[PDB]
Design a protein around this motif. Structure first.
Motif: not given
Ligand SMILES: [Zn+2]
Ligand SMILES: [Zn+2]
Ligand SMILES: [Zn+2]
Ligand SMILES: [Zn+2]
Length: 168
Positions: A49-71
């Motif tokens: 839901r847009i506007g809600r705060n949620e706790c999610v787990v970090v699944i993949r990061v790529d600082k060079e590419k600029g991505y953070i994938d979450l679950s």
């Protein structure tokens, strides 16, 4: 003025992070990491839901590419509770230091960052516990102000910090 909560500009894979859901798209939900100066992540559609705060787990990061994938799907209730708790504590540290910056009339983000670097992040580092380190030390400073003595602060900075800690 903004600044991230912790010394690191990105979370580590497997961290649980507090996010604000900003929008929903085909590939997933875009979110802002609230502890990391609102950098953008995505909750993968399979992991939702847009506007809600949620706790999610970090699944993949790529600082060079600029991505953070979450679950969201992989966060346990016990994990969500710890994240909510860390977040409240860290946000409190944030509010204290942001108030210190106002009293001292900071106008630049680097001044606020420098305050964090010389206070909260010293404790986070000393105790190797991001978030909690600073919070626990600031809270202890209420009863034992000497815990701040070793910090690289001038007399005014120290006085204003103690004042703002006390206000809580
Ligand atoms: Zn590091
Ligand atoms: Zn980093
Ligand atoms: Zn305020
Ligand atoms: Zn003490």
């Amino acid at each position: 003025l903004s600044c991230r909560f912790y010394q690191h500009k990105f979370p580590e894979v497997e961290d649980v992070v507090m996010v604000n859901v900003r929008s929903i798209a085909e590939m997933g939900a875009y979110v802002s990491l609230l502890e990391y100066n609102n950098i953008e992540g995505m909750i993968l559609l399979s992991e939702l839901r847009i506007g809600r705060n949620e706790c999610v787990v970090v699944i993949r990061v790529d600082k060079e590419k600029g991505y953070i994938d979450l679950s969201k799907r992989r966060v346990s209730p016990e994990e969500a509770i710890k994240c909510e708790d860390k977040f409240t504590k860290s946000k409190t540290v944030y509010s204290i230091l942001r108030h210190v910056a106002e009293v001292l009339e900071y106008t630049k983000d680097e001044q606020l960052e420098s305050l964090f670097q010389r206070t909260a992040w010293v404790f986070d580092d000393k105790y190797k516990r991001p978030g909690y380190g600073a919070y626990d030390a600031f809270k202890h400073a209420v009863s034992d102000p000497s815990i701040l003595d070793s910090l690289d602060l001038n007399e005014d900075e120290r006085e204003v910090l103690i004042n703002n800690i006390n206000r809580r």
